[PDB]
Each structure stands twice: as C-alpha cells, then as structure tokens.
Amino acid sequence: SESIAAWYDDLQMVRGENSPYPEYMPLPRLLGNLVLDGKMENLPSDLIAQITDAALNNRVLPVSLLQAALRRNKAEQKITYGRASLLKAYINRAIRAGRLKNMKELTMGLDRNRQD
Amino acid sequence: TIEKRYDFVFLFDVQDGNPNGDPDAGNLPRIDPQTGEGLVTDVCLKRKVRNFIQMTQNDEHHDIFIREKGILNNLIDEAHEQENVKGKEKGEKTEAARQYMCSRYYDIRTFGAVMTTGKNAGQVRGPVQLTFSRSIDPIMTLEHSITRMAVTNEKDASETGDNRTMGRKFTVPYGLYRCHGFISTHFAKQTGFSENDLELFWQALVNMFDHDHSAARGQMNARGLYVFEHSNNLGDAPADSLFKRIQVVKKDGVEVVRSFDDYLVSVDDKNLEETKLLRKLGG
Amino acid sequence: TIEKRYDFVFLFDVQDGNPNGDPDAGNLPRIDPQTGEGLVTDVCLKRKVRNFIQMTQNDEHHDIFIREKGILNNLIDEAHEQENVKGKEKGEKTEAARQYMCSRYYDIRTFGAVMTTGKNAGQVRGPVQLTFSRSIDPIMTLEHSITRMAVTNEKDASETGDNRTMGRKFTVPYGLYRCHGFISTHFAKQTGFSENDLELFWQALVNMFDHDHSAARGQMNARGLYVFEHSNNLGDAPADSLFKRIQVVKKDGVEVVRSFDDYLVSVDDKNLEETKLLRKLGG
Amino acid sequence: TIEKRYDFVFLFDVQDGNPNGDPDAGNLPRIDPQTGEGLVTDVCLKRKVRNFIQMTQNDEHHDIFIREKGILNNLIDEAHEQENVKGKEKGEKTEAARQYMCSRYYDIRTFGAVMTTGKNAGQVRGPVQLTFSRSIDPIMTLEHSITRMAVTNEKDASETGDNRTMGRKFTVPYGLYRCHGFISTHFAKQTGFSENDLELFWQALVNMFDHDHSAARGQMNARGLYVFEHSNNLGDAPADSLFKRIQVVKKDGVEVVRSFDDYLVSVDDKNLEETKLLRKLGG
Amino acid sequence: GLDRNRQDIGYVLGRLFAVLEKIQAEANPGLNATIADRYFGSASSTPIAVFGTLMRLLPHHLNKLEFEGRAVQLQWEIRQILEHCQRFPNHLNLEQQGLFAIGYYHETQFLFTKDALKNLFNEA
Amino acid sequence: GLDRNRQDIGYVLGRLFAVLEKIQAEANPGLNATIADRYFGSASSTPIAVFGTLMRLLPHHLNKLEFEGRAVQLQWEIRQILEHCQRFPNHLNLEQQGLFAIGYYHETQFLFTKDALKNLFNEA
Amino acid sequence: GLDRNRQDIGYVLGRLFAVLEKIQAEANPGLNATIADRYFGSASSTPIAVFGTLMRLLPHHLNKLEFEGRAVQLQWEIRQILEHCQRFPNHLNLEQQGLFAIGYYHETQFLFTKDALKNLFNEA
DNA sequence: TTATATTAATATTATATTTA
C-alpha cells in the first residue's frame, strides 16, 4: 500500500463538513475531472493507463495532468475537488521528484503562507 | 483556385471599444499580457469576414457555416445528402464532402473548418489564415463601468424598487491591431478558393468593421490592407521579411496612441519587386 | 426594415454639467485618460434615446426595457406568452421571442438587447450602434463642491448644531462630445428596425437632451447630427473616411472651450456625394 | 400635473455679495476658471427656491425636504409610514413613498430628490432642472478682507492687545448670473408637479432673492425670468436655441458691470412664436 | 508584505489609494460608499481621473478624522507614498494595473497592522 | 521625492499650495480649517480662483509666523516655486490636476523633512 | 523665473509691488507691517486703491534707503516695471489677480538673487 | 456542499536672501 497510500496522501485535499467528495477520491471519478465530460476519453496512454501506473507505483504523475487538470479548471471554469486534489498530487510528486524545484510540497489545507 | 500566394498585413484599429473580449478575462479585450499589447483572435477577424460575406453575398457558393442556430453537423450532414450520398465510398466520401463544404461555404473555402464531426465532412485547412492581431502598442483597456437602470430575473431585483445592474463595458481607447495573414495557394487548391473568393476576402477585410459594430466594438476600422502577392505559388520572399516592410510605429512624439493619426504606417515597397507585387488594398 | 446604412457623427455638448456620470468608478465626467477628453458611453446616449422614446411614443411597438421597475427577464418572459407560448420549438422559440421584443421594444429594434437572460429570448445586434462619445477637446471637469442643508442618514455623523452633507457636483464647464454611430441595415433586418424607427432615432438624438435634463448633467444639447446615408445596405465608403468629413476643432484662437461657438464643426460633403447623402439633421 | 414643457432663462444678479461661495474655493463665488465668469450652482438657486417655498407655504403638499434639522432619511422613513406602511409590496413601496414625497414635498415635486437612501423612497428626477447659473461676464470677486472685533475660539492668538479673527467676506461687486432651467412635463407626471406648483416655482424664482438675504450674499435680485412655454410635452424648439433668444450682454460702453443697467437683456421672441410663448416673468 | 520603496507607479498609487480610503474610513467609519466603492475602478486604471479629486477630497477627510494626530499619521504616509509618485499616470499600465490592487491591499494591511503606521511615522 | 525644478504647472502649484498651508499651519498651528481644508479643492482644479486669494492671505500668515526668520524661510521657497509658475492656470489640466496633489504632498514632505528648507535656503 | 517684459498688467503690478516692498524692507528692514502686510491684499486686487498711495509712499522709502545708490537701483527697476504699466487697473482681472502674486514673488526673487538688480541696472 | 458579520485609528516641521 505504500504506493497507493502515497497516492492517496499526495492526493489528499481539503474537504469541509458534509463534503460530497470521498476522503480518498476514486481514480475513475478523479480522472473524470480531467475528461471532456465523462471518464472514457482521458487518453488511454498518457492518462488513465499512466496515472494509474503513476499511482500504483508512486511515480511522478505525468505533465499531462497539469495540462489536463488545468485544461478542465479553466474549461469547466471551476476547480472540482479531483482537479485540485489531482493537481495537488501532481505538484507534490513533481516537488518530490525534483521536477518543480523551488516550490515546496502542497498540504491538505490551505497554506496561509506559500508565497507562490 | 488562386495561383499566387499572398501575405497581407491587415492593420485595423479600435477607437473606443472592445475589439475582441477575452472570455477568459471577463470580456476585457484580449491582451498580450507581458507586453500589454492587445490581441484580436484570428477567429475574430475570420468571424467578421464571415459576417461580411454572410451580409453581402447572400447566395450559394458563399455560405458561412453559420450564425447561432448553426448546428454545424447539420450543414455537414447536408454535405452527405448530395451527389456523394453513397457514390463516394466512405473513404473519399469525406473528401467529396470537403469539396462540397468548400464549394457552398465561403467560410470553409476561404478559412478552413473542422468539419470532421457529423457525417464526417473532412477537414479543410483553409487558404486564408489570419494570425492573431497584436496591437502595435499596449492597448490601455479602459473598462468603462456603465449602468443599467434595469435588472434581469426577479432574483437580482432590488429589495426596493430600484433595479439596476451596472455591469462593465471594456473599451480600448485606441489600439492599432496588426493582423498578419497568409493566403496559401497549396490549400486554395484543396478548397477551390479562387481569386473571386480572394477579392471577396479583400473586400471583406477592408469592410469587415464598417458592418460588424457593437456597443462592445465601439468603432473599429481597417486602417490598411497591404497584400504581398508573390509571383509563384511558392513564396518569392520570406513572409516576415515582407511583414517587416509594413513597419507600424507610434509617431514621433505620442506618449501612447489615441487614433490612427498617432501611428505612422511606413510601407517599404522599395525592393520587394524582385518578382513580387505589393498592392495597398486597404491603406 | 431600413435599406440604407447610416453612419452618423452625433456631436453633443454639455454647457455646464455632468455629461455621462462618470465611470461609476469615480464620478467625475467620464474621461479618456491620456487626452483628458471626456467620454460619454454609447449606453448613456442610448439611454437618452430610450428616455426620449419612452416619453414620446408611450406606445406598444415602442416600449423600452424601462427604468427602475425594469426587471428585464419580466419583459422577456412576457415575450414567451405570445403566439410563441411554447409552440415555437425552443430553437426558433427564442427567435420568435426576439422578433416579438424587437417589434414591441423600440429599444431593442434600435439598440440591441442581451435578452438571452430569462426565458432566453435571443440577442439583438441593435442596428443603431452609437460609440463612446469622446469630447473634441479635453473636458476641464470642474468638480464643484456643493453642500446640502440636510444630512441624509441619521448616522453617528449627523452632528448637533448642523446637518450638512457637503457632497460634490462634478460638471464639465463645456465639452463637445462626438458620438460616431453606425446604423447597420443587415442588423435592422434582424429586428425590423424601420425607416420610421430610424426617423424616431434621429428625432431622439436631436431632441433627447432637451428632455433628459438633470441637476447632475446640467445643460446638454445636440450640437450636430451629421448622418451619412449610404446608397446601399453595404458601406458606400469606409465609415471613418466619412467621419473625417465631420471634423470638429476648437475655433481659431480659443485655448479652452466654453460653448459651441468655441468649436468649428467643419463639414465637407464634397465627394461623399458619390453615393452618400450627408443629411445634417442636428446642425 | 403640467402639460407644457418650459425652459426658462433665469437671470438673477448679485449686487454686493457672495452669490454662491465655492466650498472648494473658500467662500469665493464659484467662478468659471477659463473665463472668470461666476457660477451659481444648480442647487444654490434650487435651495433659494426651497427656502422661499418654506417661507410662503407652511402647509402640507408644500413641505421642503428641509433645512438644518433635515435628516433626509427621517423624512423618507416618514413616507414609509403612510398609506403605504405595508400595503405597497416593496417593489412599489418605494414608488408609493416616492409619490408621497411628490405630493408632500414641493421640493421633490419641483426639483428631484435622491431618496434611495432611507427606507428607499425612490429617486425623483424632478421636472424643474436649473443649470449652473453662469454669470454673464467675469465676476470681479472682490475678496473683502473684513475684521471681526471678537475672536471665535480661545485660539493661538486670543492674546493681550485685542481679540480679532478678521477673515474675508467675498463679494461679487456685481454679477448678472444666467441660470438655465428646464421643466419637463415627462417628469412632472412622474412627480405630480402641478401647474400650481409651477406658479409657485415662478413666484419662487422672482421672489426668492428678496428673502434669502445674507451678509454673505448681500443684495441679490431675480433680474429676469424669461420662460419659454412650449405647447407640447415635447419641445417646439431646441432648449439652447431658445436660450440664445435671451442674450445678455454688457451695455454700450461699460468696461465692467456695477449694476443691472450695465446689462442689456435682449429677448428675441421674433420667431419663437412658432407655437412657443416667451413670457417674461421677472423682466 | 509592503514594499514602501517600490517606486512602481501602480504600486505607489495603490498604496496611496489604500491610505486615502483608510482616511475616508477613519473620517466617517460608517460610510456607505468608500472611495473603494466609488473611485477604485478608475483609480486602479485611470489615476488622473480620480486621484485629482481624491485629493480635493483628502484634506476634508483629514479634518473629519476625530483624532487630530491620526490625521498627521495618515497624511505623512500619503506624502511617503507620493514621493514615489512623480505624476499620476494617465492610464495605469497593465502591470501597474495589477500592482495598484497590490498596493491597495499591501498598504491597507500596513494600515490595519496595529502599530505599523504609528511606529513607522515615529521613525521620521 | 520632490522635483524642485519640475516646471509642471500643476506640480509647482501643488508645491506652492503645500508651502502656503505650511505657513498657515505655522502661522497658527491650532487651525480648524487650513487652506487645505477650505481652498485645496479648487487650488487643485481652479488655481486662479484661490491662488490669488491665497496670496492676499499669505503675507498675513508670514506676519503671524512666530519665528520671523521662518517667514523668510518659507517665503523664499514660495518664490522658488513661483519662478516655475509663469501664471496661475485658469483650470489645471488633468495631468496637472493630479500633479497638484503630487506637489502638495511632495512639498509638504520637503517642508516636514527636518532640515530641508532651512538647509536648501542656506544654499541661496 | 521672471519675465521682465511680460506686459501682463497683473504681472507687472506684482513686480512693482515686489520692488515697492523691497524698498520698504530696505528702507527700514526692521518693519512690523511691510506693504505686503498692509497693502498686498488690494494691491493684488484693487491696484488703483493702494498703488497710488504706494507711490506717495515710495520716494520716502527711497530716501530712507541707507545706500543712496541702492535707491537708484530700485527706482530704476520700478521704472522698468512701470513702462509695462500703462495704467494701474481699477480691478485686477482674475488671471491678473494671480499674476500679481506671480509678479510679487518673481520680482522678489529677482531682487533677492544676489547680483541681478545691480547687474541688470548696469546694462542700462 | 460548505459560509455568511468591522482590523486600524492620537502631530511630521518650525529661526533673515538681497541691499555701491
């Protein structure tokens, strides 16, 4: 579990009370925040088939999440938990891989700091 | 089809208005942020040329692939209800559909169109490719807060009788946007885009702002259309070595512009005549 | 519908008053920053026209999208209670509602309306498109501090020995705003904006300042309405080359303007006679 | 209400006094910078009208929206405690309160009143709009530095020799200010501004300067009130073309004005009789 | 988070507007439409439009300030800001467009941090 | 942050008004309505309106100045300012509108910087 | 910053009053109420009122000037000013209202610039 | 889906140029 734990701990994101979002958010429903409108068109080679490999193995989430999650952020004009959480996972693992050098890893909570 | 390749510099300005609002940015005009210079999407001018052709032509072979109730797959499926319903063998059915959509729709014949969508009508590149229009100088988007003495649905109606929804009207107090464009001959061969369709496009570029007026545009004009018509189907000269002939600068002592009379548009047709024409269609 | 494309310079001055209150982001006369030239939003003059039509017509087929009690979605959902109750098949239901409130609202026929709000009733392009009226010379806004002998709120600061609420009455000592406007026949096809609607619009531009008077705006007048009636639906000549005909300058030696007698409105109808009619309606 | 649109050139004069002190410029009479011509605010004359009506009426239907102890929200809340305490359905509760004002307050019937403040009592435009009354020729503000032989406070110099707080009594040595006023029936019918109310306004203009006498403004006189009565709700002539009929100029060879006899008020009713009536109430 | 010596005309004007509204909101704290609510839209974009009128309007707020020394406190930092403002720019640059909002909220923080203005004044 | 040789008529008038109020506020420091509180609104916009009266009013403040040499100090910089003022403009330009407030607070800083006027006078 | 040939009657009268007070303040430098302190208010507005009396009063200051050649120095520039004054205007125009204060301080600078009057006299 | 009530607030500076 140390790779799925790290997947669901890099993916941890804030939830209020009675948040309709699961504590650990399912990958298909998580990747469904990257998809056009429903999770089947998320690219079965750099995405659903590679996020899972980047999740099952604690590898670095592909840039195609920033790219896709950002695409949906400004395309759905909102950041669903699942795009915030998935971006938190990407950026946390980009930091941890030294792929995002200066930045420091995100936390669950709002960082009333972070200067970024 | 056309047998010359054209590279045109289309200087068009906005005097008091939103040339092309950025939906990403409220509706405030598109701007090259790190230089503040305004932007007007290529699709914006292609749209106003579409509006111009839809305005003037009013005839088949120059339709526009069109306005709001313009479900594009409806037009595309009209293509597949043609001489090529079955007789064109799905492989080249889409190619015959391209040839149709190019024949009927001047939008498609002139600009391209992604029509691979319904009863797939192929994928037209479009000989005419306007670029983005980056204003010569930073547009100083004014963002004129306005008022309305009326509201919308009686959910934003005031708890008193005083309904009002001030809202915002972004205007460029002046911006001389400069749109580089390319009439590529190789794709004119694909779409059948002819010198008649091209003269239609030049008229459209010159007159596309006299007709597409909004409370948003305020006043936009076509300050110049310098068309570099190459001798070859190929390019006689590199396109940007031409576009640098149309050097548009703010004049000598203007802190920032407020009219076309604040820009000097120096056209350098000195040596391009190597084999090649420059026709000042708009300016 | 109209069949000739009018492009009009509508010069209007403000003798001493706040022409267009101001940006609402501020309330000192709406200025162009760089030039200091006053601005009057196109919507301000459109509202002067709307108020003029509202007082004058007081008629069906000339309603307005009215003042305070003006929940617009009320007037839009009212359009969905006609021949197009629902039998107009939402696609063209909004178009039928759009035609209904074009016909009904002189506002919408003349100037557009974003009616896509309530029971969505289409958007109207508004044949008549005034632009931001920008004063010929920098308005030298006076910003007269006035007083009130009466405090408004029973606040903490409504003190013992006097209730005063100084307040400020911004005023343009004089400014000859210039409103280029465009009447597009193509978009008057989409509203039924008629030659009579357009004569009402001219009557409005001429007479609408004599009726929309206020303490804030002082005295404000239609100093000129030089319309260019193109011979055809298209543009007989580029709009700005026509608005350059109505060249307004300060007179010979007036450093600052105090009245319309401080403004040479030079007008040359020399070559527009080609196919334009320079109808000098307002002056 | 009233059925004729009026436009009145109200010439008044200040003999030796501060016609309208500028709070921005001490108590100096408001000057027009560019020409030195004195300005009397919209609201200076409007307040003289209010004070006259306060004097002469002392009844309901002519309350004044009033002086020092004039918390306006108090009067506005008093409107919401009427026949419309709860029966008027907040949307039109403000309209009913606005009508209660435009019944009670000759102020609000005649001049508008911004009453959107308290329990919102609407927003009255008020028919009679007086413009900034600009003096005919440059007021030579005389900046009379006066002495007072008693200090006000125990200030930094209430010392041995004497107590003195000189200060200045700015006086226009004479200035024939020229207010322009517009009475629009279209806003009378909104505020119930009656013809009797208009006669109160005329008596008010011609007599308000016999009563708002002050040490500050010395002697002030309604020196002429030339009212153009259009036949219609709409105006027979443009308001300014009417106001140019009352042209006021220095007399034959007066370098500067020290009396009304230095001013020639030439009315021009030769052609206004189209259907209008120039009627000289004050001169 | 306030660069008191930024010299970025947008940022110094934002700071200036922040102190202007601080004075207005200390002149009469019960205020329907502060200059943020009525002037900010152009102060951020057309500083010449308002900032002239904002300082017609400023000495009167300084008068209305109940604590007469607080008026000196705030006027002093208006001057501290305006040393960095050689001119109210006609139209704020887009960089400066944003830096005006930056300045408004930076200087607003600096004013609503407890001792900052009263301290920083006393080192002058 | 004071361009003593700016020549921008708005800026020189702002400087002039700053020194005028400095004198008024040194004439009698306990002052209900300084010329900022009563004249600034038009001094910033209509300099001809007040600035005539501001200098009816100026020699009397120079008299009321307790330190008779301080009167020379401030009158000297009034003259230094007014060399740059060939005329009180009828209406301050909008650029100049803002530059008047700039001048008021620039010159007010220059006056409330400790030794500046007394120094800068001694280099004349 | 002095247009010695301005011809603006307000400006030439301001210059004239500046030299008049220069003479008064060189006649007896220890002076409670210079003509700025007693006459300027109307000299700036009603030049006929004082400027008649200012020149009853002028030859006596020229006498009281300790350096008898300094009297010629200052009287010469009074004449230089008064060439531009065809008449003391009844009431100074408002433009001229302000230009009088301009002239007072321009010519006062010209007099308190070290060698200016003694030089400029020697080119006559 | 949720949440939804006011921080900060008391004085800078302040003494004479020019005068054959």
PDB file of N, CA and C in Angstrom, chain A residues 21 26 48 53 73 88 93 105:
ATOM      1  N   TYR A  21     -17.530  14.843  -1.478  1.00  0.00           N
ATOM      2  CA  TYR A  21     -16.340  14.224  -2.032  1.00  0.00           C
ATOM      3  C   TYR A  21     -15.805  13.159  -1.086  1.00  0.00           C
ATOM      4  N   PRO A  26     -11.942   8.284  -5.796  1.00  0.00           N
ATOM      5  CA  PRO A  26     -11.678   7.185  -6.729  1.00  0.00           C
ATOM      6  C   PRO A  26     -11.039   7.676  -8.010  1.00  0.00           C
ATOM      7  N   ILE A  48      -5.348   7.733 -18.034  1.00  0.00           N
ATOM      8  CA  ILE A  48      -5.921   6.689 -17.198  1.00  0.00           C
ATOM      9  C   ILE A  48      -5.035   5.451 -17.093  1.00  0.00           C
ATOM     10  N   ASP A  53      -0.454   3.926 -13.393  1.00  0.00           N
ATOM     11  CA  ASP A  53       0.914   3.488 -13.181  1.00  0.00           C
ATOM     12  C   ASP A  53       1.679   4.496 -12.346  1.00  0.00           C
ATOM     13  N   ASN A  73      -9.833  22.915 -15.402  1.00  0.00           N
ATOM     14  CA  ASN A  73     -10.019  24.004 -14.458  1.00  0.00           C
ATOM     15  C   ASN A  73     -10.544  25.228 -15.168  1.00  0.00           C
ATOM     16  N   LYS A  88      -2.822  18.641  -6.709  1.00  0.00           N
ATOM     17  CA  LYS A  88      -2.021  18.540  -5.504  1.00  0.00           C
ATOM     18  C   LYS A  88      -1.134  17.317  -5.564  1.00  0.00           C
ATOM     19  N   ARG A  93       4.209  15.390  -6.214  1.00  0.00           N
ATOM     20  CA  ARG A  93       5.176  14.444  -6.747  1.00  0.00           C
ATOM     21  C   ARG A  93       6.180  15.106  -7.673  1.00  0.00           C
ATOM     22  N   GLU A 105       6.225  21.234  -1.225  1.00  0.00           N
ATOM     23  CA  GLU A 105       5.080  20.358  -1.424  1.00  0.00           C
ATOM     24  C   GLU A 105       3.818  20.972  -0.843  1.00  0.00           C
TER      25      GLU A 105
END
